[PDB]
Amino acid sequence: XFLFX
Amino acid sequence: XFLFX
Amino acid sequence: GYDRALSIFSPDGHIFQVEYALEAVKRGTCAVGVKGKNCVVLGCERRSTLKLQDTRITPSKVSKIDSHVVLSFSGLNADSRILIEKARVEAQSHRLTLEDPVTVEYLTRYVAGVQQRYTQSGGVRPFGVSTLIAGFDPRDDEPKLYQTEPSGIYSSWSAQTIGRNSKTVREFLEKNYDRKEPPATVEECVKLTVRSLLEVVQTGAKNIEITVVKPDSDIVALSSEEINQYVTQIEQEKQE
Amino acid sequence: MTDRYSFSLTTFSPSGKLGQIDYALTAVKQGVTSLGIKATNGVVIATEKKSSSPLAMSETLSKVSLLTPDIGAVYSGMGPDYRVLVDKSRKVAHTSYKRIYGEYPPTKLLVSEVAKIMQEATQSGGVRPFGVSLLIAGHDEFNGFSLYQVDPSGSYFPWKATAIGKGSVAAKTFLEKRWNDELELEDAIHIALLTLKESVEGEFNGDTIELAIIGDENPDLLGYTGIPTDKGPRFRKLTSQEINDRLEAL
Amino acid sequence: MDIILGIRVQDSVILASSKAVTRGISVLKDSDDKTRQLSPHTLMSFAGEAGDTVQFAEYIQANIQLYSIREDYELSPQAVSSFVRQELAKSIRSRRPYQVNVLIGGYDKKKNKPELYQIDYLGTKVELPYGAHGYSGFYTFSLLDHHYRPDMTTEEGLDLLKLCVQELEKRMPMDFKGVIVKIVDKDGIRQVDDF
Amino acid sequence: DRGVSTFSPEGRLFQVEYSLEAIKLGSTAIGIATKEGVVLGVEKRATSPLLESDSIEKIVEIDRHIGCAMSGLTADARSMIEHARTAAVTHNLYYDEDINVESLTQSVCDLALRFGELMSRPFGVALLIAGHDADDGYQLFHAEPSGTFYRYNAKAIGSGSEGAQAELLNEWHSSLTLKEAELLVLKILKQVMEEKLDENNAQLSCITKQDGFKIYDNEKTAELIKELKEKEAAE
Amino acid sequence: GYDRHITIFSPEGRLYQVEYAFKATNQTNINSLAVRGKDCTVVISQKKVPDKLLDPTTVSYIFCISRTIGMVVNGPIPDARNAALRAKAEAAEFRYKYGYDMPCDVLAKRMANLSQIYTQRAYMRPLGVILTFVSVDEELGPSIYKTDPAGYYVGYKATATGPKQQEITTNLENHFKKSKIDHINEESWEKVVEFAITHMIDALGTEFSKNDLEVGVATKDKFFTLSAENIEERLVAIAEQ
Amino acid sequence: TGYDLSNSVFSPDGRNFQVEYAVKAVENGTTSIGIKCNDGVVFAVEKLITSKLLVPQKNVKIQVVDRHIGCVYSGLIPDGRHLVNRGREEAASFKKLYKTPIPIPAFADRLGQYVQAHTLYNSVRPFGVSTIFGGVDKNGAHLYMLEPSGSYWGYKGAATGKGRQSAKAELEKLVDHHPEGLSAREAVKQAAKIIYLAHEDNKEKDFELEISWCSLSETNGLHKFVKGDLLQEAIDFAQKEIN
Amino acid sequence: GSNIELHSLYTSREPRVVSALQMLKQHLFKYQGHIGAYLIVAGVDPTGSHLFSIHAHGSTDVGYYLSLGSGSLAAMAVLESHWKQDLTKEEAIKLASDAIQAGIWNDLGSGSNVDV
Amino acid sequence: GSRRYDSRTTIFSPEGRLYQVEYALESISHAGTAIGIMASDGIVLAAERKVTSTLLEQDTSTEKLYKLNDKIAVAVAGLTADAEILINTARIHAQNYLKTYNEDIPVEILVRRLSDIKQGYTQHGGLRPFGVSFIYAGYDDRYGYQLYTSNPSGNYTGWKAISVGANTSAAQTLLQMDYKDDMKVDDAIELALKTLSKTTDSSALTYDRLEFATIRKGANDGEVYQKIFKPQEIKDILVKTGIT
Amino acid sequence: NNYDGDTVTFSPTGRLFQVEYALEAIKQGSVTVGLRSNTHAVLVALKRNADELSSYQKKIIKCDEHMGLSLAGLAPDARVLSNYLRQQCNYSSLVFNRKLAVERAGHLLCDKAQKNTQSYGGRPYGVGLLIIGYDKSGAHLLEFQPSGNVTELYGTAIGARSQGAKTYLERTLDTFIKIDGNPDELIKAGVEAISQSLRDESLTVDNLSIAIVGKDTPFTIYDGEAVAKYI
Ligand SMILES: [Cl-]
Ligand SMILES: [Mg+2]
């Protein structure tokens, strides 16, 4: 997995 | 089971 | 949802929709109930305006609610089906929860309760139906005959009639039915019921239906020939 | 607030008439003439673009609508009622058919669904009937070409050819004389233009006439190549120029 | 655990059902009847989770009895079995499924044929010459596979069932306190006292 | 037409005032309260001689300490009785005691004005609610379809009410015995009834602290009718 | 005669409540005009402040629906503001769901569909307003789309609304019969506004001060209204030729 | 005919007669006014003393919304209270989501849309009040007046009720004689005078004066009631002007 | 695809990629990744040419070259090595099919033919 | 409020009749005549299309005769649109029953349900009744061949021969005269057409103005076939019986 | 006339006839008086019997320890509104540990009555209420009309012949307001006030109903031989 700075 | 590239 | 109050009071304290529902009953084919010492008989008129009818499949006027209770009616046929269905469901519901079949008084009280509810519920008109409910309570040999009407009032009757020309056949029963000595046998009770209908019916052919209910779930509908024998015997005694 | 009109506004009168449906049909009668003709190899639907003002851009108002790639619709009566029916008709073609069977509904079943929507506005609480009659032309693999009329009541009938609205009675007489079972599509268009000229008062050209066909597959209008079985839509709206070309051979 | 067996012979269906109601290490009863009369010619035996078993059977009994009164007709065993299966098939995907396994023994008056149906709590239905539910089913199947014949009489059927129960008593580790046997034929439903 | 909950220019609800006309057409019901108990009596008024009169139920038990007589569209009363019984039992479940007669009456009267566009119309029936409690002793209440209730030493409702009430005005005193009250109900019923009063077309009942609510046997009422006839012939 | 009170058909196949809603449209006694340039769409409307106690800045019948779409209303202000709030809500919702600015003609269609429902459903009354939507659409360019209480809508080369619409309509009709083009062949929006005001003056036969007019302009990627001083500059240019 | 029996029915004119009948209820009510000053707004109202038994200064008519908006109305007092209750909900929801207190024009449309909604259906009655309201926001002072139809505009001065014609005439003089503007303290004095002058239309019964104000300088942009010395100073000024 | 067709008919406009993209991501986000759809959404519309990717949880991103699936790392290796600005049609087909081949050979989840 | 405009579709007249039901029956009396005749070896359904045109596509047209399942068909008299609402409801009930019991629905059970729906519209909801009368032609293995009718009241009755729609009085007299119990399908076909031919308001009875259907055990062995006659087949049976 | 069918319809002169008809129900009701000093607030109510066998209909309802009302009109409507006040008084106590202000109780009754005058299907309340209470700002008397109009007063009367009592209080205003720390004398003034509304009938032991609330006095109702002192 789930895209995630 | 299911079809899953 | 449609909420409109159709059954309301008028200045003279009448509910016209309930009274007009009674007029629908008045129009309906005649139905008569007579209880003997050890039986109840339900007689019903079949208007002979309809021939080429299939009598095998045509809805019969007397309906079994359980194996031990029957319901006949006068008024709107379509309306009667809705009361019969509700009564049949409540009969099985009672057996399921109380582990005992309904008393005739309980089944009557239920049907009468439904009729009443439709006189002070929004968006609904009263049932254009009066019922005769007859049978024997579980493990009882005392005959039971009750009447209901659109208002929702009910009561027990030694003998009673409803529908068109019911005034005439009630007149007959009031002078011909003795309370101290009711019809002792099935024969006597069926005879008095056929006699009462012959005051109004026209021809004693396929115009009279008879259903005999005895104790312990013993219910049978008489055939054309069986009724025709009663019609023959009554008029041969009358020729004197 | 709340919609407290839960009761029917369309009831039976002592004569057995449903007033609101009769009055809806009266509205359709006042409406501009539209017609449909069925040929051996196609169907044509046509109507007059009655422009409310010359300042108004009549191209922006579509009287002839695509429902599916193979089904078109035209109307006579109240335009707004037609527009919302086309929106509901397009949606029901997807929700009640294409999302289930993975193909567009046949003409007769989409007509059946539109008919159902119009019947409900004839019985449901707190609504009036739709003030339109539809002509629906369509093709499908197993029924071939077909033309249907739908009335405010929700009743629908299949037609070889017919007309609705202002000059329908005269138009239907004209079509009865000209129609045979050996008509090619071009012959049906020619007859459609001849029939429509009788009911039109003013200008009669490609800019004042709206005409569409259900004919051969148009692979040039599909928008993509690569799938042999997808050959493109059978519904085509004729251009202003294409109409004027056939008015010289008139 | 509970024993329910069914055998369909030439002209009848016989249902044997254990009389013991046990919860954990406690024997609650030794005379329990795990059967309901659905119609005059249809009988249902049931085994499973406490409460669910009776509640399901009585619910099915009420619905079939309602159909009988309304139509003045008896539903065929095939029709009753299909209704029962569909009620169980609904329940598996419900909030709390009925954990009931049933045998339906019926005599079809139209076809003049006895029919046995085995339905599990999932709504899995098969028509069988003989059936059973639980641990007992595997032993009884192997024994019935050997001995069973299609043209057996009611008396022959009872003797084979008698052998099954005897062998189950020896082989089974739990005490099921004997069985109640009921026969379904053209004349109706009757209970065999001697067993 | 016009609203069901509409007020008249005099400030009365049309439908309530009309329901009060329905109650006037109803069979007579009388209640008399004493220090020894409360008596409840009704005219049965069978429409035909073939109608089994004992099936006419116009006196009804709500709890052991609360009786009820009705007059008007008697079918309407069934749901009111049902509610009253539920209220009486429910209160006993919640508080382990008998519910006060006033509280029970108040509960029934809260249904009265629950009508509009809830039920479609008011009730077409009046109730005499008689009972005993430890706080206010023997009590008789008149519950109308208006939602109003009055306590009464004695009260008559139905077709013969204004004639009966004038009679109760003269006859009632604070020292009345239960036996005196029974005869007094029978006397006034016999006065306002169309048909001749007997044990089959009239019904008695009472509520005492000791025995609770009892509907009198036809044999018991018959004896009180015979006792009445003799004492009226005595002067 | 209850067929005149709710939106059901009369025996003639008419909806009287729709017809009477059209009459409410002129209750304000205000005339609006809309024309298209090459790069812009201009809408002008009469402004009347009869009471001295009124704050004239708050008296407006032109609405900024989205950044791109403007709307002028002919009808009472309550129904105008009802229609304005709804169009603003619909335009915002469209952008969220479909990821691009609602086109002028699509909003017009949506508000027309809502209007149609009031003519078919009894419990809802029609709004007594005619809505004129203007924008420079990214696909169709300068756009005028007008809605009425019947639920009718169409595109326009130009349009006019109010008591004296026919006088303004014929004036515009006559101009486009000469030029033989579907727009005002003018580069700047300033000159297209000057054309709009000039042709309204000629049509109504009345002169205008800066406080007598109300102007809305649609360019690519914004719609805006002119101040009294912006209009004064426009009126000065007209007088000086 | 019959077009005036049901709300939301258009007459052949294109008029809603039920809304026009609501206006009659408003015309029947006591006089209420609003004055827009340099840096705020002043509200005043006529309270008829029906009986000596009325407790002076207790039956308050002017209502606050949030902390910065004043509301006064003429007509059916309960209908006004109902509208202010909605206004308080609208102001609460706006502040909850957007943090900032509701601007006056924003608040005006919230009432406007709500009142207009009561002209769309026959299942509801139009509001029997004209409402004068306003206050101070980030963009300065705003005075609004809202009719039963849902119609509202911004005002330099506003009046409604039985003495509106008299009031309007007095407001029109102030607008002409003060183009540069009026101070908050001056507007309180003038408000008092205009109510006393407008009382000639209700001269049978004596009355009680009630004033409120929101001023950036005098109240820090919050709605406050004029009390004690400042109220007596305004009454004295008003009494001097009628004599 | 169905809702885009109805939208296109309603608006009388050819559908836009941003519309399909917005409708897909709002649907996938609603179902919090439980609808396991990982899509690369491309197309031409009146606005121009567009290329997007959308992950199952409703996250979208914009690129000149994207890859998704088990063979994405094999494919992205080829794209990162051979991609440049201002590709011709012939070059872009070659690069795209080469990136798929990378997946086919080196990923056990990918195989058989190349669809373009 | 809204009360003002309510017709009150579900009230009794002072005579104890349902206004809307009575007026719906008046509507149906103007609809094209539909006849059902039940024989020992099958059932006939004959029905007259209302004043047609030469430009109506007849071979793809259906207004009178509809299929409910493989064993049951209906003839319609009244609003076609209203009928189609009820027909689709009946088709679903038939499939619900088959899914539940794994047996084709008995004819009466299907008839009773449709009749119970019609009844509901007369007692509650404040909506207009369905302006439709049905003739049900069906076969099951309990009662064999069955004819029923239902009307907007929701009342239903069984028949050996029956008519609905226009000139039922005249039609019922002609059927009551020529019908016998031992009658066969071929004879019942002839009776149905002869009855329409005499009762019709049209100048002559032709193929293009009729819809015809038979339910026969005339299916190879122990099974039942539904035959919806094609235009050319109606033309042939008109020549055979000697009407054209 | 044509405009009195329902509460949702204005008349051509802007009147609500259904509300005015509800107001009429109050005038038919039996007389009740309310008056207060700075320390105490008193309700005096003439109870009405059906006949000599009947009880005298109760007029005064307790809402909290510090608040209650007297009714004139439809008693069932007074029960609905008094139950609502009891709940609102109760909510204030439980949630905020705060005795509900009499003024705020008025505002809540007003808003509840209003909703029944603007919506179709419903009807106005057919009762008038006199609310007395002692809160943080001392003694209070309120008059409620089912139009929604609630008024704070030193004294008032509602019901049949109420004008007689209202005139007396208007004369006595300066006297009875000063009756501080003397409950008996304030009740005497209330009994002397209601006496101005009597005709034929006089105040008996089972006829008169009195209620009082004050500084160190919870809301208490006096009936029977408890009011014989004041006859
Ligand atoms: Cl839309
Ligand atoms: Mg409408």
mmCIF file of N, CA and C in Angstrom, chain J residues 82-132:
data_model
loop_
_atom_site.group_PDB
_atom_site.id
_atom_site.type_symbol
_atom_site.label_atom_id
_atom_site.label_comp_id
_atom_site.label_asym_id
_atom_site.label_seq_id
_atom_site.Cartn_x
_atom_site.Cartn_y
_atom_site.Cartn_z
ATOM 1 N N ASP J 82 -51.001 -2.671 -18.057
ATOM 2 C CA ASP J 82 -51.388 -3.160 -16.705
ATOM 3 C C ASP J 82 -51.214 -4.681 -16.647
ATOM 4 N N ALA J 83 -51.629 -5.386 -17.703
ATOM 5 C CA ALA J 83 -51.561 -6.861 -17.808
ATOM 6 C C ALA J 83 -50.098 -7.309 -17.725
ATOM 7 N N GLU J 84 -49.203 -6.643 -18.459
ATOM 8 C CA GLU J 84 -47.766 -7.021 -18.558
ATOM 9 C C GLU J 84 -47.092 -6.901 -17.185
ATOM 10 N N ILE J 85 -47.483 -5.915 -16.370
ATOM 11 C CA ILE J 85 -46.988 -5.758 -14.969
ATOM 12 C C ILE J 85 -47.328 -7.039 -14.202
ATOM 13 N N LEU J 86 -48.585 -7.480 -14.287
ATOM 14 C CA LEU J 86 -49.114 -8.657 -13.545
ATOM 15 C C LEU J 86 -48.521 -9.950 -14.123
ATOM 16 N N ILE J 87 -48.382 -10.032 -15.451
ATOM 17 C CA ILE J 87 -47.860 -11.236 -16.167
ATOM 18 C C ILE J 87 -46.434 -11.532 -15.684
ATOM 19 N N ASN J 88 -45.576 -10.510 -15.586
ATOM 20 C CA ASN J 88 -44.155 -10.653 -15.161
ATOM 21 C C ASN J 88 -44.093 -11.105 -13.698
ATOM 22 N N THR J 89 -45.010 -10.615 -12.860
ATOM 23 C CA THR J 89 -45.150 -11.008 -11.433
ATOM 24 C C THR J 89 -45.491 -12.499 -11.351
ATOM 25 N N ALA J 90 -46.446 -12.948 -12.173
ATOM 26 C CA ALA J 90 -46.924 -14.349 -12.253
ATOM 27 C C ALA J 90 -45.787 -15.259 -12.734
ATOM 28 N N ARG J 91 -45.048 -14.836 -13.763
ATOM 29 C CA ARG J 91 -43.901 -15.590 -14.340
ATOM 30 C C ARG J 91 -42.847 -15.832 -13.254
ATOM 31 N N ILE J 92 -42.618 -14.839 -12.391
ATOM 32 C CA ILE J 92 -41.616 -14.900 -11.285
ATOM 33 C C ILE J 92 -42.118 -15.863 -10.203
ATOM 34 N N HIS J 93 -43.390 -15.761 -9.799
ATOM 35 C CA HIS J 93 -44.000 -16.637 -8.760
ATOM 36 C C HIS J 93 -43.870 -18.100 -9.198
ATOM 37 N N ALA J 94 -44.166 -18.389 -10.469
ATOM 38 C CA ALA J 94 -44.087 -19.739 -11.075
ATOM 39 C C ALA J 94 -42.669 -20.299 -10.905
ATOM 40 N N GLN J 95 -41.650 -19.469 -11.144
ATOM 41 C CA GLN J 95 -40.218 -19.865 -11.072
ATOM 42 C C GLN J 95 -39.767 -19.971 -9.609
ATOM 43 N N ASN J 96 -40.306 -19.125 -8.721
ATOM 44 C CA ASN J 96 -40.068 -19.174 -7.251
ATOM 45 C C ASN J 96 -40.549 -20.524 -6.712
ATOM 46 N N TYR J 97 -41.763 -20.927 -7.093
ATOM 47 C CA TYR J 97 -42.399 -22.202 -6.675
ATOM 48 C C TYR J 97 -41.548 -23.375 -7.172
ATOM 49 N N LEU J 98 -41.143 -23.344 -8.447
ATOM 50 C CA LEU J 98 -40.299 -24.397 -9.074
ATOM 51 C C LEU J 98 -38.965 -24.498 -8.327
ATOM 52 N N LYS J 99 -38.349 -23.362 -7.983
ATOM 53 C CA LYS J 99 -37.038 -23.311 -7.275
ATOM 54 C C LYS J 99 -37.184 -23.939 -5.882
ATOM 55 N N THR J 100 -38.295 -23.660 -5.193
ATOM 56 C CA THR J 100 -38.543 -24.050 -3.779
ATOM 57 C C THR J 100 -38.856 -25.551 -3.690
ATOM 58 N N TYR J 101 -39.777 -26.041 -4.526
ATOM 59 C CA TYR J 101 -40.402 -27.388 -4.414
ATOM 60 C C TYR J 101 -39.919 -28.331 -5.524
ATOM 61 N N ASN J 102 -39.211 -27.817 -6.535
ATOM 62 C CA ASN J 102 -38.665 -28.621 -7.663
ATOM 63 C C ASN J 102 -39.833 -29.300 -8.392
ATOM 64 N N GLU J 103 -40.984 -28.618 -8.445
ATOM 65 C CA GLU J 103 -42.212 -29.044 -9.170
ATOM 66 C C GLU J 103 -42.859 -27.808 -9.802
ATOM 67 N N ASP J 104 -43.442 -27.957 -10.994
ATOM 68 C CA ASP J 104 -44.203 -26.884 -11.689
ATOM 69 C C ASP J 104 -45.374 -26.473 -10.794
ATOM 70 N N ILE J 105 -45.653 -25.170 -10.711
ATOM 71 C CA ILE J 105 -46.717 -24.601 -9.832
ATOM 72 C C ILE J 105 -48.075 -25.118 -10.299
ATOM 73 N N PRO J 106 -48.920 -25.649 -9.383
ATOM 74 C CA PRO J 106 -50.322 -25.928 -9.695
ATOM 75 C C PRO J 106 -51.040 -24.651 -10.154
ATOM 76 N N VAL J 107 -51.955 -24.783 -11.117
ATOM 77 C CA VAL J 107 -52.593 -23.638 -11.833
ATOM 78 C C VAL J 107 -53.267 -22.717 -10.809
ATOM 79 N N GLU J 108 -54.066 -23.273 -9.889
ATOM 80 C CA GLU J 108 -54.882 -22.483 -8.923
ATOM 81 C C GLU J 108 -53.967 -21.616 -8.047
ATOM 82 N N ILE J 109 -52.839 -22.156 -7.581
ATOM 83 C CA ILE J 109 -51.909 -21.440 -6.654
ATOM 84 C C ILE J 109 -51.415 -20.161 -7.347
ATOM 85 N N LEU J 110 -51.023 -20.254 -8.620
ATOM 86 C CA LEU J 110 -50.581 -19.093 -9.439
ATOM 87 C C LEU J 110 -51.736 -18.095 -9.574
ATOM 88 N N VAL J 111 -52.933 -18.584 -9.916
ATOM 89 C CA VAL J 111 -54.168 -17.762 -10.103
ATOM 90 C C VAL J 111 -54.485 -17.026 -8.795
ATOM 91 N N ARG J 112 -54.474 -17.737 -7.662
ATOM 92 C CA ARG J 112 -54.831 -17.179 -6.328
ATOM 93 C C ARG J 112 -53.893 -16.011 -6.003
ATOM 94 N N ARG J 113 -52.591 -16.167 -6.260
ATOM 95 C CA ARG J 113 -51.557 -15.148 -5.927
ATOM 96 C C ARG J 113 -51.824 -13.867 -6.722
ATOM 97 N N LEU J 114 -51.987 -13.987 -8.042
ATOM 98 C CA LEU J 114 -52.276 -12.841 -8.946
ATOM 99 C C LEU J 114 -53.564 -12.148 -8.492
ATOM 100 N N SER J 115 -54.575 -12.935 -8.124
ATOM 101 C CA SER J 115 -55.894 -12.455 -7.638
ATOM 102 C C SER J 115 -55.732 -11.735 -6.292
ATOM 103 N N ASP J 116 -54.827 -12.216 -5.433
ATOM 104 C CA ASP J 116 -54.571 -11.639 -4.084
ATOM 105 C C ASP J 116 -53.882 -10.277 -4.230
ATOM 106 N N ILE J 117 -53.054 -10.108 -5.269
ATOM 107 C CA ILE J 117 -52.348 -8.829 -5.590
ATOM 108 C C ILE J 117 -53.392 -7.782 -5.983
ATOM 109 N N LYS J 118 -54.297 -8.143 -6.900
ATOM 110 C CA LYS J 118 -55.413 -7.284 -7.383
ATOM 111 C C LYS J 118 -56.281 -6.844 -6.201
ATOM 112 N N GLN J 119 -56.617 -7.778 -5.305
ATOM 113 C CA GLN J 119 -57.428 -7.534 -4.079
ATOM 114 C C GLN J 119 -56.769 -6.427 -3.249
ATOM 115 N N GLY J 120 -55.454 -6.519 -3.034
ATOM 116 C CA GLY J 120 -54.676 -5.560 -2.224
ATOM 117 C C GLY J 120 -54.882 -4.127 -2.689
ATOM 118 N N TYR J 121 -54.913 -3.916 -4.007
ATOM 119 C CA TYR J 121 -55.044 -2.585 -4.658
ATOM 120 C C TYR J 121 -56.451 -2.011 -4.440
ATOM 121 N N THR J 122 -57.393 -2.814 -3.930
ATOM 122 C CA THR J 122 -58.798 -2.402 -3.657
ATOM 123 C C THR J 122 -59.011 -2.127 -2.161
ATOM 124 N N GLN J 123 -58.099 -2.565 -1.284
ATOM 125 C CA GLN J 123 -58.282 -2.479 0.192
ATOM 126 C C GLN J 123 -57.266 -1.524 0.834
ATOM 127 N N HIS J 124 -56.110 -1.271 0.212
ATOM 128 C CA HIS J 124 -55.051 -0.402 0.796
ATOM 129 C C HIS J 124 -54.160 0.200 -0.296
ATOM 130 N N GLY J 125 -53.421 1.258 0.055
ATOM 131 C CA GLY J 125 -52.399 1.889 -0.802
ATOM 132 C C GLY J 125 -52.900 3.157 -1.476
ATOM 133 N N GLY J 126 -54.221 3.298 -1.636
ATOM 134 C CA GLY J 126 -54.857 4.473 -2.262
ATOM 135 C C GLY J 126 -54.482 4.633 -3.730
ATOM 136 N N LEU J 127 -54.106 3.540 -4.404
ATOM 137 C CA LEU J 127 -53.788 3.524 -5.859
ATOM 138 C C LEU J 127 -54.988 2.962 -6.627
ATOM 139 N N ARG J 128 -55.082 3.268 -7.923
ATOM 140 C CA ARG J 128 -56.152 2.746 -8.813
ATOM 141 C C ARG J 128 -55.936 1.246 -8.987
ATOM 142 N N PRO J 129 -57.015 0.443 -9.125
ATOM 143 C CA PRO J 129 -56.867 -0.988 -9.388
ATOM 144 C C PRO J 129 -56.302 -1.234 -10.796
ATOM 145 N N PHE J 130 -55.881 -2.467 -11.081
ATOM 146 C CA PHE J 130 -55.431 -2.903 -12.427
ATOM 147 C C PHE J 130 -56.672 -3.102 -13.300
ATOM 148 N N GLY J 131 -56.742 -2.395 -14.433
ATOM 149 C CA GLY J 131 -57.865 -2.465 -15.387
ATOM 150 C C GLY J 131 -57.714 -3.658 -16.312
ATOM 151 N N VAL J 132 -57.712 -4.868 -15.745
ATOM 152 C CA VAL J 132 -57.380 -6.139 -16.454
ATOM 153 C C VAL J 132 -58.293 -7.259 -15.948
#
